[PDB]
Amino acid sequence: SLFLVGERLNATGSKRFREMLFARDLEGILALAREQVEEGAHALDLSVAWTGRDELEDLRWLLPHLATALTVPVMVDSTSPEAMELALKYLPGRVLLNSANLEDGLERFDRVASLAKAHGAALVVLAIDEKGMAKTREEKVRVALRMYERLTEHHGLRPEDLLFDLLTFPITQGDEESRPLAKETLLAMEELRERLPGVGFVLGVSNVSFGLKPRARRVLNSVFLDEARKRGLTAAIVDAGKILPISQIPEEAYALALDLIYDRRKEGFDPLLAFMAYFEDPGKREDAFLALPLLERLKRRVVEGRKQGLEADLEEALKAGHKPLDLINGPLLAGMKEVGDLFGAGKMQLPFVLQAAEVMKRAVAYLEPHKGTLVLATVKGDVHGIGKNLVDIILSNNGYRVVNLGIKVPIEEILKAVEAHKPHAVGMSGLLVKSTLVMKENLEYMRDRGYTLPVILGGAALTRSYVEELRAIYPNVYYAEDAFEGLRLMEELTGH
Ligand code: B12
Ligand SMILES: [Cl-]
Numbered sequence: 334s335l336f337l338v339g340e341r342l343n344a345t346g347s348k349r350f351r352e353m354l355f356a357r358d359l360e361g362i363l364a365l366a367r368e369q370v371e372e373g374a375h376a377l378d379l380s381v382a383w384t385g386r387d388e389l390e391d392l393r394w395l396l397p398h399l400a401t402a403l404t405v406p407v408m409v410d411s412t413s414p415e416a417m418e419l420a421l422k423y424l425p426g427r428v429l430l431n432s433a434n435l436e437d438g439l440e441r442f443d444r445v446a447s448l449a450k451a452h453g454a455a456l457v458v459l460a461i462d463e464k465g466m467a468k469t470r471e472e473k474v475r476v477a478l479r480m481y482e483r484l485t486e487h488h489g490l491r492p493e494d495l496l497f498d499l500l501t502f503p504i505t506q507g508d509e510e511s512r513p514l515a516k517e518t519l520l521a522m523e524e525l526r527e528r529l530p531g532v533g534f535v536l537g538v539s540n541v542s543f544g545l546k547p548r549a550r551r552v553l554n555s556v557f558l559d560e561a562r563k564r565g566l567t568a569a570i571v572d573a574g575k576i577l578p579i580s581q582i583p584e585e586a587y588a589l590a591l592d593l594i595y596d597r598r599k600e601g602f603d604p605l606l607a608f609m610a611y612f613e614d615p616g617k618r619e620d621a622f623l624a625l626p627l628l629e630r631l632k633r634r635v636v637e638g639r640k641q642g643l644e645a646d647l648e649e650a651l652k653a654g655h656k657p658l659d660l661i662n663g664p665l666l667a668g669m670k671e672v673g674d675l676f677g678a679g680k681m682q683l684p685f686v687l688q689a690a691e692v693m694k695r696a697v698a699y700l701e702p703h704k705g706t707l708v709l710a711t712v713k714g715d716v717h718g719i720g721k722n723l724v725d726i727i728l729s730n731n732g733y734r735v736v737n738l739g740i741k742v743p744i745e746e747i748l749k750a751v752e753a754h755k756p757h758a759v760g761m762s763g764l765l766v767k768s769t770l771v772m773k774e775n776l777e778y779m780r781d782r783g784y785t786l787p788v789i790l791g792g793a794a795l796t797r798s799y800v801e802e803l804r805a806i807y808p809n810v811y812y813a814e815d816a817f818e819g820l821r822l823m824e825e826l827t828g829h
């Protein structure tokens with residue numbers, strides 16, 4: 334076996350741990366810890382970061398009790414090195430620091446590495462640098478080799494004390510950008526095992542499968558964990574519970590998982606859709622679709638995501654004298670809204686949602702030719718691009734114009750693009766906890782400059798309560814818990 338690291342002592346991540354931390358329930362925490370150890374964990378990932386709380390106070394209370402009471406080492410998961418500094422003092426024995434990246438240059442990287450060197454801790458090294466996330470095999474190797482040279486020579490850390498996180502992206506939303514990102518980590522890990530013998534590799538294996546039903550997640554995580562092990566993986570941040578042995582995985586579900594991990598596309602074979610097909614017949618439902626009356630058949634094109642002969646159905650409508658506005662605002666919008674309903678309820682998964690959007694892209698393409706504007710950015714010091722990109726796709730394919738500023742965007746650059754495009758709203762994403770502070774700060778500035786424009790903050794880490802606290806600063810803020818609340822809020826603020 335591998336050095337498993339337990340993922341449930343996470344305030345943002347785990348709902349149980351969140352509550353227990355907030356209620357100061359030491360014995361409950363310690364139970365969840367021992368539970369994970371029992372399920373196979375060799376160490377534990379502590380993250381007590383959460384919106385509107387002092388991480389350092391929570392740590393000052395919990396760390397002393399854990400030190401006397403835990404069998405396994407702790408992995409300190411904090412963006413703040415101050416937290417890291419504190420923890421190394423309140424937790425003797427073996428330690429692992431989680432992160433050490435070059436996202437914001439050599440200051441925080443060298444800070445964390447010299448901490449690790451001083452207090453004999455292991456280091457996780459994420460492949461994020463000054464130009465962003467290492468998404469390809471070439472990028473991962475380039476960044477990794479730089480960090481290795483730097484930790485081993487400048488900081489004098491031993492290779493054995495370093496765990497490279499070459500980054501686990503979800504491959505379980507439709508987007509063609511994400512298709513090969515699991516493969517690219519895998520092929521990089523193999524390359525770096527050869528180039529850098531001595532070094533650990535760690536992955537947040539659960540990420541590969543984010544935005545899937547727990548049945549399909551367990552499987553995909555397990556298969557991916559295994560492929561990783563065979564390419565150099567030494568450690569893994571997982572739910573010790575939600576991991577099957579490869580033995581307990583049917584040969585079909587196995588082969589499909591592999592097709593998705595390695596992006597094994599062919600004419601008429603979508604890995605992701607096929608893997609989802611399992612876990613939710615074959616010849617029978619096909620015929621049922623063709624039987625539908627066109628009013629509901631055009632609505633089911635949007636809902637099921639059938640762009641296979643969609644141009645043919647869209648003529649039969651216009652041959653009944655139905656106006657192209659009537660088809661867009663009636664059946665095709667009814668379908669889209671229902672995908673919004675289904676996703677907001679938590680029934681539909683993302684890939685079908687994106688094919689829904691792509692059908693409304695191809696439907697407007699045939700009907701209209703022969704709505705408003707949103708300036709969207711991810712805030713300073715946050716590289717989480719995927720959530721915003723989803724919002725881009727949804728609004729784009731429902732008629733809104735989206736100005737996508739990319740990531741790490743400072744308020745000055747946003748307002749520069751507000752002044753140029755005069756949008757109906759500003760969208761700011763950010764999934765990290767410190768990003769919520771950057772949003773507070775930005776609103777303070779926009780209040781200073783005398784703006785009254787709607788600002789939608791869609792970063793996950795956003796208690797509606799804090800958003801109410803932010804209304805004291807800037808009155809026209811909105812929280813979008815999901816990308817669809819985005820589309821609803823753009824409809825309300827333009828009059829649709
Ligand atoms: C895969 C992933 C990554 C990938 C990046 C993928 C990406 N987004 O580019 C990698 C591995 C590189 C990464 C890095 C890190 N991660 Co990360 N990541 C994740 C993960 C597992 C999923 C992200 C994802 O793609 N979600 C899928 C999308 C589709 O959902 P979403 O972005 O939340 O967006 C939805 C809504 O919020 C909304 N939305 C979001 N923004 C906006 C904006 C607008 C305007 C609107 C309308 C809507 C909207 O719409 C989307 C659809 O509903 C999350 C887990 C999670 N979300 O709980 C952790 C998570 C966000 N990561 C986190 C952390 C800390 C890190 C790291 C420091 C590493 C570490 N030590 O854990 C670095 C951050 C680097 C930096 N300084 O920026 C934490 C943040 C909490 C914290 N404060 O500590 C999380 C919660 C994990 C945890 N510890 O519980 N991560
Ligand atoms: Cl590069």
Ligand SMILES: [Zn+2]
Pocket residue numbers: 443444447
């Ligand atoms: Zn130094």
